[PDB]
Amino acid sequence: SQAKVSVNLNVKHVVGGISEFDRTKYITIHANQIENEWDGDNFTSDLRDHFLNGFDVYLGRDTGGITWNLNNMQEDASRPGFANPSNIISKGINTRNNYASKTHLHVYENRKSNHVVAAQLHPFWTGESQIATKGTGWELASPTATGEYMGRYFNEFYGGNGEPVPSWIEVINEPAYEALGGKKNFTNSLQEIADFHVEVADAIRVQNPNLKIGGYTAAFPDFETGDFQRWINRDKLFIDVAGEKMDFWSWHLYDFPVIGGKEDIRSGSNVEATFDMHDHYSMLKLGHKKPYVISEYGAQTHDFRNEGWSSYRDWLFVRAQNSLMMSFMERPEDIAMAIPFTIVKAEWGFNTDKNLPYPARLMRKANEPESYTGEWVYTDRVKFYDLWKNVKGTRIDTKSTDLDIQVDAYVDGNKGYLILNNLESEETEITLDVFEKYDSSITNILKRHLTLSSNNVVIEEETFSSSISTVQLGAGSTMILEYTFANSLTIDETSTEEKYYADSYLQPIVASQPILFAVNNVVKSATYGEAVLRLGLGRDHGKSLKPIVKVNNTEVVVPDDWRGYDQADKGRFFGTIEIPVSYDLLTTNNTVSVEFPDSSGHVSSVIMQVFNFSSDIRT
Ligand SMILES: [Ca+2]
Ligand SMILES: [Ca+2]
Ligand SMILES: [Ca+2]
């Protein structure tokens, strides 16, 4: 594979007003610094420091606190099925006081800006699978009782002298996964879960109206399944039923690189189509977008579930998290918080029947996999953080000739961070076209290559004293070039990205029948720019993904090589084809014509991604 990556160090890339890397939202871990797992017999005396400070990692998410407390909360004697308010209060005092006493944890509040808390499914869920509180043995009366508890919980177990209230409250973790029949089900309705969210959110807001509340924390947002029936029955329905009650959308986005020997990957076009369709419908139905909390993402490793830790298994996660995070970094204004699902130790997740530890761990005992003994040492998932430890600064315009090379770049004064992320399993020779208007010289490039070498995660580093023109980006690998310039870079050009949504979505594809889309009110706020027509395509394998596309009745070239892999092992293709559209083809109200040679499937979403350049930066 070969790709040319253009890097315009003076062009700030703005979207939704955001043009700074937000490590508090992106470089995160599914932890809370209060968790005992940060302590213990660790390879270092201060794991919190070594990890959170050492790699400048942010927080975070936890569910056990609210779940344990509900599981052990006394019942309201006057209102069966409700948590007793005075016991929520009383227990909250002890929690806040305990927190206040953990003085050495208080510094890490400045890393908890996007604290996410989700209720676990039980005993919060009031549906058919509802169980009584594990400790006190009573069943939540209603979603209202659940929301009231949660509302009281967040009022009493946070604030005051205790832990600051979390910033993102997910109503309930992965409510549909089991109850609605799993990832391939598309017939079951999310109606009850949606009503659950509305009712819980109403009750939370009653107790605390200043909590951002989200749902439905989908385990697997798979919109295309069953001719998009799954989308209709679940995620569309959630927007329809709960949209006006949610402050944010919550998703878990997991690549499945090794599920029954299949490679079912969200990274690339699929996750893009997922955001695209959900955004598009949200625009059509609600008239606005909501931020996403990706409270779990990365990879799961099903074919390894009967195996312990391995570096390669960490790789599968590390590769997924990179490729997925790059997509989240393209949409900073839509991302409230994205947390790779990496638990510090997940001792609570140890599988005693299998004598295997939880798969998703920052730490492992040194003697693993051979023995669950020895001090806690890092898994190779730390290499992700190691690689990203320095990324900060102003996002600048980057571009790849190959959509499988996801590029981003951030300039922090005289430090430049160029991220090259390989969606594909091919090594790619990247030609670097780094343009800088003001001659500012490179004093140093630290080339940090996070890749798979001998089935282990490694960061291969080379250092350079002058510009480099080509790098080898490994298969599925991520490279950060940490540039140092003689002087702070002047970022006086601007690429303002605005996204525009067709007046229609989810359009059935009929052979030789053009699907006509209006993409209207496109502000061409500059003289120079470029646009990306984003066609969400949901089609069976074997159906064409190269429609004839016209923008304002001018035919535009549809790439044969879309962002990401082929999706062969996925149930079907669901992915956004990113179609270069020239700025001069764009007008205010645009028609998009999409015509396939074959029937079936749908143009799930149509988004015109418009980039408005302060100057002719492409030429
Ligand atoms: Ca770009
Ligand atoms: Ca390619
Ligand atoms: Ca591709």
Curated annotation (Swiss-Prot):
Thermal dependence of activity in this record? Optimum temperature is 30 degrees Celsius with agarose as substrate.
Signal found in the keyword field: yes
UniProt keyword annotations, A-Z: Carbohydrate metabolism, Glycosidase, Hydrolase, Signal
Coiled-coil segments on the chain, per record: none
Q: According to its UniProt record, which residues of this chain constitute the active site?
A: 174 (proton donor), 296 (nucleophile)
- In the record, what terms sit under GO molecular function? beta-agarase activity
The UniProt catalytic activity note for this protein reads: Endohydrolysis of beta-(1->4)-linkages between beta-D-galactopyranose-6-sulfate and 3,6-anhydro-alpha-L-galactopyranose units in funoran; Hydrolysis of (1->4)-beta-D-galactosidic linkages in agarose, giving the tetramer as the predominant product
Q: What is its EC number?
A: 3.2.1.222, 3.2.1.81
Q: How is its activity regulated?
A: Agarase activity is enhanced in the presence of NaCl. Agarase activity is significantly inhibited by Zn(2+) and slightly activated by several divalent ions including Mg(2+), Cd(2+) and Ca(2+).
Q: What pH dependence does Swiss-Prot or TrEMBL list here?
A: Optimum pH is 6.5 with agarose as substrate. Exhibits more than 80% of maximum enzymatic activity at a relatively broad pH range from 6.5 to 10.5.
The top EC class is: hydrolase
Notes concerning its domains: An accommodation pocket formed by Phe-341, Tyr-254 and Gln-300 at subsite -1 (cleavage subsite) contributes to the methyl-galactose tolerance of Aga86A_Wa. Docking simulations show that the canonical tetrasaccharide of funoran (LA-G6S)2 could adapt to the active cleft, and the G6S could be accommodated by the subsite -1.
Family membership noted in the UniProt record: Belongs to the glycosyl hydrolase 86 family.
Functional note: Endohydrolase that cleaves the beta-1,4 glycosidic bond between beta-D-galactopyranose-6-sulfate (G6S) and 3,6-anhydro-alpha-L-galactopyranose (LA) unit of funoran, a polysaccharide produced by red algae of the genus Gloiopeltis. It releases the disaccharide LA-G6S as the predominant end product. Also acts as a random endo-acting beta-agarase, which can hydrolyze agarose tetrasaccharides and hexasaccharides, and produces disaccharides as smallest products. Besides typical agarose oligosaccharides, it can use methylated galactoses.
Protein name per Swiss-Prot or TrEMBL = Funoran endo-beta-hydrolase
Q: Which organism is it from?
A: Wenyingzhuangia aestuarii
